[PDB]
Design a protein around this ligand. Structure first.
Ligand SMILES: [Zn+2]
Length: 323
């Protein structure tokens, strides 16, 4: 009876030295991400809408053009909603599908439904078009290194549909894509042919990005079983800062501060956390001032903060994967 599902508990990062950190900082481009990955997503894309289809095609196309051996799957399903039965489609992009373990980065790609108001349309720039674009930029910036994966551990990206409630949040109206996928993964043997382990046992850590893009975000260390990874993000931010590799950034105004948050935040990690998956929830507290407002747009995004977070996240992923 293999103890492989316990490997995640002892897994240590392979820390990048200064030269490698400079290489990662120089290898990501916030302007390229902005034009090629982010702007095409700054559209109305609530579940079932034409924009949802366009966003999904965009995400798939951007991953498909990369060299690394990404395996794309569209997880489509029906669910009851306040408006009756509707169809949703999660996007899953996986390197090494049969590898037993995967580090998983995720965000939601749907935008909250709002009827047009005074000619304005809700595009959820920080919620979560930026997180989507950060995951796509990470895949592009680290493409050569990820290609080398073609430690039975690899990388998976999940773009959840239906994170938002169609009305106001409630237990049955929200997290459509994540409740469905968590249940599906929990009931899917992994690796292929396994007798008693599931795809959830294979999830080393779920790093969920949400509401990123506003100025001065502060991310709390939410869970004790991922606290050591939160500390790594703090260390990475501190070293990139000391090396002069971050922009318009100070340690007093750092993003990963020594502070927990005992409350519960409802988001896509919930269906996974309640099934025992370790979660690193990269959501700020408090939420952006523009949260669920028509002002959650491109104009209110903080470019350098997103650039800094791209660097931190890419270093974190390479260190986790030993790349
Ligand atoms: Zn939202």
């Amino acid at each position: 009876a293999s103890a492989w599902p316990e490997e995640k508990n002892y897994h240590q990062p392979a820390i990048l030295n200064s030269s490698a950190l400079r290489q990662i900082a120089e290898g990501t481009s916030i302007s390229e991400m902005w034009q090629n990955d982010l702007q095409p997503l700054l559209i109305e894309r609530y579940p079932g809408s034409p924009g949802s289809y366009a966003a999904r095609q965009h995400i798939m196309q951007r991953i498909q053009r990369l060299q690394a051996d990404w395996v794309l799957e569209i997880d489509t399903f029906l669910s009851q909603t306040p408006y009756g039965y509707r169809s949703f489609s999660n996007i899953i992009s996986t390197l090494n599908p049969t590898a037993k373990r995967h580090l998983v980065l995720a965000c939601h790609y749907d935008s909250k439904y709002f009827s047009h108001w005074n000619n304005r349309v809700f595009v959820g720039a920080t919620d979560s078009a930026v997180p989507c674009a950060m995951m796509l930029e990470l895949a592009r910036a680290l493409d050569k290194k990820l290609l080398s994966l073609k430690p039975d551990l690899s990388l998976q990206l999940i773009f959840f549909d239906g994170e938002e409630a169609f009305l106001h949040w409630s237990p049955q109206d929200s997290l459509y894509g994540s409740r469905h996928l968590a249940a599906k993964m929990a009931s899917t043997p992994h690796p292929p042919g396994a007798r008693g382990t599931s795809q959830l046992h294979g999830m080393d850590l779920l790093v969920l990005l949400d509401l990123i893009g506003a100025p001065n975000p502060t991310f709390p260390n939410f869970f004790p079983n991922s606290a050591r990874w939160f500390e790594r993000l703090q260390a990475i931010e501190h070293e990139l800062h000391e090396l002069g590799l971050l922009k318009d950034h100070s340690l007093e105004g750092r993003y990963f501060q020594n502070y927990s948050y005992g409350g519960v935040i409802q988001d896509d990690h919930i269906p996974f956390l309640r099934r025992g998956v370790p979660v690193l929830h990269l959501i700020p507290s408090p939420f952006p001032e523009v949260w669920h407002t028509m002002d959650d747009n491109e104009e209110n995004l903080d470019e350098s903060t997103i650039d800094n977070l791209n660097k931190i996240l890419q270093v974190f992923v390479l260190e986790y994967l030993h790349l």
